[PDB]
Structure 1
Amino acid sequence: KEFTEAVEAKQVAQQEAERARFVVEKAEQQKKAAIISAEGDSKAAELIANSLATAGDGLIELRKLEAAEDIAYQLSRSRNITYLPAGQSVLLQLPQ
């Protein structure tokens, strides 16, 4: 069963090797696309970085406060979310 399968694998692998030279080309193009989309996200991010670096940590904390509303909004669609103060000696003991 491995003889015909090996021959077809060699043929399909030559087809896929040429198709995959062109798929490495496609991958350069698709990476232009994915880079630029993940960088939709992340260039929004870098302009946020510039805003917070020039202006200071204003919305560093205030999306750490506005989006901190997300904590109370969204923590316990489950049932066991919580926290524990620091600068201290907490006896952490997760719930059951």
Structure 2
Amino acid sequence: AKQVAQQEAQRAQFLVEKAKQEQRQKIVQAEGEAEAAKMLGEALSKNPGYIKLRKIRAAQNISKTIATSQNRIYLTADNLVLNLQDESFTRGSDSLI
């Protein structure tokens, strides 16, 4: 029994080698992230409006996904912009000053 488990541990030795390969994968991905961070963070350090626009785009993309989703979605009616009589109505233009 124990010797069979020791051979399983020999398999685990190859799984340690597998973990080393996984480590190289992880480092490669991290290198990609570091280079991306320099390039992108430089641009966004001047003005992050890109992120804002990207967030808007994300909303649209998400709406296309969930439009065909099996999920049950309860969602605020404020997204319908129908309440013209509230205080939030002007906030956007108020932000523009």
Normalised to the residue count of structure 1, the TM-score between the two structures is: 0.52
Superposed, which structure 2 residues align to 1:80-95 within 5 Å?
80-83=73-76
> 1:66 matched to which residue of 2?
57
Superposed, which structure 2 residues align to 1:7-46 within 5 Å?
7=1, 10-37=2-29, 39=30, 42-43=33-34, 46=37
> How far apart, CA to CA, are the structure 1 residues paired with 2:32 and 2:64?
23
> How many residues are matched?
75
Q: Which has the higher strand share?
A: 2
Distance apart, 1:15 and its partner CA = 1.4
CA RMSD of aligned residues (A): 3.1
Residue type of the partner of 1:61?
K
Distance apart, 1:60 and its partner CA = 1.3
> How far apart, CA to CA, are the structure 1 residues paired with 2:32 and 2:55?
18
Q: Which has the higher contact order (CA 8 A, sep 6+)?
A: 1
Stretches (4+) displaced over 6 A: none
Identical-pair percentage: 39
**Equivalent of residue 47 in structure 2, options 56, 60, 72:** 56
Structure 2 segments unaligned to the other structure (5+ residues): 79-97
Normalised to the residue count of structure 2, the TM-score between the two structures is: 0.52
Distance apart, 1:70 and its partner CA = 1.1
**Which string of whole-angstrom CA distances, capped at 9 and with x for unpartnered residues, describes residues 25-62 of structure 1?**
3202222214434x48745763434432x233122111
